[PDB]
Amino acid sequence: MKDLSHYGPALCVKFYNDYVLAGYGPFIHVYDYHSATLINKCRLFHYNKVHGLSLSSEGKILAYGARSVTIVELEDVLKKESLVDFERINSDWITGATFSFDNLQIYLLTCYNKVLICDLNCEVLFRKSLGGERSILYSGIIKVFGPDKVYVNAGTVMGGVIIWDLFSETKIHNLLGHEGSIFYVNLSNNGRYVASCSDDRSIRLWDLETGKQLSVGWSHTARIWNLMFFDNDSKLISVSEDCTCRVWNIIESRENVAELSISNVYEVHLIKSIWGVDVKDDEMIAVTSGNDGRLKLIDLLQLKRHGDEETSFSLDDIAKQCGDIFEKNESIKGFQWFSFGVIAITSLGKILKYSDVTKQWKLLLTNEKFNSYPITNGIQTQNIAVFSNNKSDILLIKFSKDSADIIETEEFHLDELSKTNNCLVTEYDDDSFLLTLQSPNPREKFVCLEISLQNLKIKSKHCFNKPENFSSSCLTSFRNHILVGSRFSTLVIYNLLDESEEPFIIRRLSPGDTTTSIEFVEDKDNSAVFSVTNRDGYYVFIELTKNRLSYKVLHSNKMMKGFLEGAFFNSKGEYITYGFKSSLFYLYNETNCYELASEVCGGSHRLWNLAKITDGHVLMYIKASRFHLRKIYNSIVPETLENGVHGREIRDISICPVSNTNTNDNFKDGHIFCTASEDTTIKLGYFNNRTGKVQNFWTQRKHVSGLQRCQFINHKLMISSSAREELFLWELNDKYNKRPYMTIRQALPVSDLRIMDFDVKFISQSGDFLLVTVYSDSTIKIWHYRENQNKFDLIMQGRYKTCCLFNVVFIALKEELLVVISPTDGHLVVYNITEYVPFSVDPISGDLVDHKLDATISNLPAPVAQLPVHQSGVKSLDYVANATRTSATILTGGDDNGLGLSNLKLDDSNKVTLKTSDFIAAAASSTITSGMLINGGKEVITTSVDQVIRAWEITAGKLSLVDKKRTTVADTGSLEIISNDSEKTLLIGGVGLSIWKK
Amino acid sequence: RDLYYRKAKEQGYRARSAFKLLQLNDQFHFLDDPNLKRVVDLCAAPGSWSQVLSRKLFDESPSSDKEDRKIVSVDLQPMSPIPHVTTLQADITHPKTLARILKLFGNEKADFVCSDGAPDVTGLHDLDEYVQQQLIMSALQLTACILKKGGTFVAKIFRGRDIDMLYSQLGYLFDKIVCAKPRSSRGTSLEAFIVCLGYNPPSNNKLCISDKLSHWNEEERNIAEFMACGS
Ligand SMILES: C[S@@+](CC[C@H](N)C(=O)[O-])C[C@H]1O[C@@H](n2cnc3c(N)ncnc32)[C@H](O)[C@@H]1O
Secondary structure, three states: OEEEEEEOOOOEEEEEOOEEEEEEOOEEEEEEOOOOEEEEEEEOOOOOOOOEEEEOOOOEEEEEEOOEEEEEEHHHHHHOOEOHHHOEEOOOOEEEEEEOOOOOEEEEEEOOOOEEEEEOOOOEEEEEOOOOOOOOEEEEEEEEEEOOEEEEEEEEOOOOEEEEEOOOOEEEEEEOOOOOOEEEEEEOOOOOEEEEEEOOOEEEEEEOOOOOEEEEEEOOOOOEEEEEEEOOOOEEEEEEOOOEEEEEEEEEOOOOOEEEEEEEEEEOOOOOOEEEEEEEOOOOEEEEEEOOOOEEEEEOOOOOOOOOOEEEEEHHHHHHHHOOOOOOOOOEEEEEEEOOEEEEEEOOOEEEEEEOOOOOEEEEEEOHHHHOOOEEEEEHHHOEEEEEOOOOEEEEEEEOOOOOOEEEEEEEEOOOOOOOOEEEEEEEEOOEEEEEEEOOOOOOOEEEEEEEOOOOOEEEEEEEOOOOOOOEEEEEEEOOEEEEEEOOOOEEEEEOOOOOOOOEEEOOOOOOOOEEEEEEEEEEOOEEEEEEEEOOOEEEEEEEEEOOEEEEEEEEEEOOOOEEEEEEEOOOOOEEEEEEEOOEEEEEEOOOOEEEEEEEOOOOOOOEEEEEEOOEEEEEEEEOOEEEEEEEEOOOOOOEEEOOOOOOOEEEEEEOOOOOOOOOHHHHHEEEEEEEEOOOOEEEEEEEOOOOOEEEEEEEOOOOOOOOEEEEOOOOEEEEEOOOOOEEEEEEEOOOOOOOEEEEEEEOOOOOOOEEEEEEEEOOOOOOEEEEEEEOOOEEEEEEEEOOOOEEEEEEEEEOOOOOEEEEEEEEEOOEEEEEEEEOOOEEEEEEOHHHOOEEEOOOOOOEEEOOOOOOOEEOOOOOEEEEOOOOOEEEEEEEEOOOOOEEEEEEEEOOOOEEEEEEEEOOOOOEEEEEEEEEOOOOOOOEEEEEEEOOOOEEEEEEOOOEEEEEEEEOOEEEEEEEEEOOOEEEEEEEEEEOOOOEEEEEEEEEEEEEEO | OOHHHHHHHHOOOOOOOHHHHHHHHOOOOOOOOOOOOEEEEEOOOOOHHHHHHHHHHHHOOOHHHOOOOEEEEEEOOOOOOOOOEEEEEOOOOOOHHHHHHHHHOOOOOEEEEEEOOOOOOOOOHHHHHHHHHHHHHHHHHHHHHHEEEEEEEEEEEEOOOOHHHHHHHOHHHEEEEEEEOOOOOOOOOOEEEEEEEEEOOOOOOOOOHHHHHHHHHOOOOOOOEEOOOOO
16 A cells, blocks of 8 residues: 555644745655745654654754654755655654754753763764653753753653753753643743743743743643744744644843743644744744644734734824814714725714825815715725715715825715615626615615716616515625625525516525625536625525526535624635624634634724725724724735644545536546544545645534544435434535535434434435434434435334444345444344335345335334344444345454454345354454445455554455555544545545555 | 543542443452452542442452451542542652552552553643553552562553553563453543453563563564453
């Protein structure tokens, strides 16, 4: 077998003259970080991950991890696939490694606080150690200040930081004060300071000269795994189990030596931990490496780099420039960003202009009509401001590009409207835009005006009847229709060519209320796709087809947290979202699940606006009687060097099966697949068949608890299950050009207890299917899923005993439908349900036929076969039937690290016999977690927690081990295999994901 | 959070882990022996295995087999007292901690030494497994002495990538090495227990058992026998 790609825990990262070197599983990855290009992947260790690495000035790399250490040439790492022959194994765990000052020796710190001085073949020359009783270390570093001044800085499990002089073997300090084990120690470059961190969640700054504690910093919310000084020892950066990277100021004064002060918090990795960090002082950039396999680049000067990121003005500042013109209780009530800066309007209808160039405010004009609750809208790209009020009045003003002179103005009143409570605008075409106005009277009209971009005159006015439960919240135009977002998750589509035509009404798209954005995505044939966001966090992608219109939901999901106020696609095709999490504005890359920026607004955040500008966005908002301008610049470097996968266990993996349907040509070089994680999400992505490179599309968040199973049951349907009887049927759409879409089709009825497993059998032509589920309480249920009424009907229920049931599988042999379970007692138990369900089995390829009878709940019959196989729980269950579907061979992997092969047969009289064919008692060193039959049952691939992938062959019902290979994926627990046309692709899941070829 | 956390509070056990030692003894039956007399619980905090030892050896035993029975439970952290248990706050490596344990028996070797100790996992599996092997090794050197020849030693293990090294590092010292999950052991944990039966012949800041078992063993892996435990 050959390993192709790996995404998983990346324990360390180093900046090196325009490279990032990342310890990435057992490899080093070398990136050109300005372009985010992966130059090479070089395997350094046979199986151990790289915990630490450092570079000599002359390009030698010292790397260590667990008991492995190696010295390797940067030039070889740049071009070779593997350098594992240079790996050496030390007898003890290696806590740290540094080059000697002249790079002629290396110093290895063991977990027992001994230093091994080695030559550059990693051979020991001598050892240094302290006197006294042993210390066990969870961290430590060797800090080389000069040729003969080497400090060993040891973080013990007991919570002391021992700092001692290497060559004299002399204790300098025993820094006490932490409450837990010490998980990282670092020293400032200028020799002034020690920093340590623990699982007490504190960072402690120590005086390296006096050994006194200077400052204790409490900010991180979980254990801290790494920290270091940067920016000439004026700042500290830390990285944590809480998935944040935190920057601290070292504030030096006379009266207190120095103190830590929190400066910035960056949430940068997926749940959970962050292991590695490094800073490039010149550019003030950081790099972090996560348990999720993400490598994140952080602009440490997001708020300062260009010098205009943050600005605020109170009404007094503004009055200092416009003059004392504001009345008692007058405040800014609307604002828009244009090329020149801001146009704002006050509660008394004063229209103000802020120039981004001169930084000056000035009064432009007053329109007393708009002292009656003015609303502000705009067409940013065309420098058009739109003012409305509650008295059916409208004011349009157009501004010159740089000058900001008023070059067009129009005003009008709409007699159709009594009171007006909502005004929306959207772009229409090269010459005009649309404006809608609504009133709360149910009998008044919904008014849409088409307005010239050139002189702001009305080209046409349309008046529509409002459907019953309709309050417009957002607006987009498409061809000759307007799509109007409404409350209650309603979307109303009107036809601008025929205001008497009945509107097309999409009700209840999501559980939420206000529709916040409608955005055109793509079109194909006679269908157009739209993104529709909802304030309460839900977003839906709908497909509008011209056949009269019809619609289908292609995608549905919920943001992790907070209000969702809009979403758009960037030039890379990534879904970008924005909204609020309580008082915090967010801009979030929802495709790859990382935050782009955030801002503390006014809690209630009643007045805010976001606008796109060249090289970023401007966020405008009112907070605490101040008008704030936050410029959100595109990062000076790429956001990530790897996007990453889950940062917790991957419990299941499913590849979308090949089909005769019209899967889009973009996916032709690879496969769409799902990972299901204990982090409670399902991630839908793609991998390239040749390179194993993985790309993310979506992170589905419906499940409330950790996933157990996900399986594509055919080319467009997928079932997942977790606990709380969460079982969801999903529908996938892969017909469009850039990404697949997935939406929930139905959830299983619920009776706490878990759905441990399921299996399905399709009902011939139907797209209906039978579903069996087994539960923690030993119950068994059989369901009929019917497409047209989109529901699950319970047709059978029963119980095995009381113990948990881990796996279940449908087996169709001859004209019988069999159910096979594997309880925790280690038995294989067979049920023949044929007589008790209104379905028939076709004798070959075993297809179900619907008898179209009414739904009765049968009781589960007594088992027809009970064979003991394993001495404990059965973790993996697979089967393959023979060519005549008269028998099946059943493969089981056990918690007893045994591998079982059993035979299920029907005789001429249809009597079921289950007999065991072979049992390998020591098939693995630990729990066997996956066991799949391939090549018509001739071969077996197994996975187990010992991180050894085993390939087997079956000859005459007997198993023999034919190949084995280690993976870095710890806690190896999921496996998926697909044939290419036989050569196979293996997806290997646990903590991390690896793709292999066989 | 689950079933056993609930029934631990119902039975007055300090932790759900109490059922792991009970579900263990539902076979091996090393605590159902009337002849069983002296036991040591290492890294016992907060003490639920010592409660189980107390209930089985005293509350649930005829007065006829309660004589010279002595339960010592050791942890560096201080423990709330348990009826019929001498709790020692000591380091399993320190001096008199074998001498003091020596004295609380009549210079008799223990029938049975158990340890359910484990640090909180970090999520870094290679570190978590290595640290767990450390605890077992250091626990093993007290068990090397105080254990009666032919007496069982029970310890919690991290049943991961390098467990097979521990099994054969442990071959030199036991008649039958067994490995068991109970059923109160969470499916989401890499947990298992190494139930070492029939203590066989041992040997005859400095050198420790971890480096001298690393000395002889070295880089070899064997697979111990497996045994489910509960009913
Ligand atoms: C998982 S807890 C043990 C659980 C306990 N046996 C029970 O069932 O209630 C781990 C314990 O190991 C202890 N420990 C770690 N190192 C030790 C040492 N060197 N000497 C004594 N105890 C130690 C810790 O104090 C901690 O109480």
